[PDB]
Design a protein around this ligand. Structure first.
Ligand SMILES: [Zn+2]
Ligand SMILES: [Zn+2]
Lengths: 6, 85
């Protein structure tokens, strides 16, 4: 899932 | 930031924890506006075949399911969060 940590 | 949080409507900056509702509305949400744990956020980040669905709206996870699944993974009860999709 796309997060800012991606 | 250019995007507002889909829950609190304030800006989301790239140095905040935030997740995209890829399952549906494609809005960003601050982690802390969703109730998502730090562990669910970390495990979702690295699972390419998981997508998150926000409270307003491939393996789909709501916050509650991602939180339950992460607790199981960290306790060795589940091999990955996908077991809870
Ligand atoms: Zn917010
Ligand atoms: Zn959504």
């Amino acid at each position: 899932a796309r997060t800012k940590q991606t | 930031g250019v995007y507002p949080c889909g829950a609190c409507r304030s800006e989301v900056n790239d140095d905040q924890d935030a997740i995209l509702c890829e399952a549906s509305c494609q809005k960003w949400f601050h982690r802390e506006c969703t109730g998502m744990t730090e562990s669910a956020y970390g495990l979702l980040t690295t699972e390419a075949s998981a997508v998150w669905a926000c409270d307003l709206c491939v393996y789909v996870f709501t916050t509650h399911l991602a939180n339950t699944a992460a607790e199981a993974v960290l306790q060795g009860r589940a091999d990955s969060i996908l077991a809870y999709h």
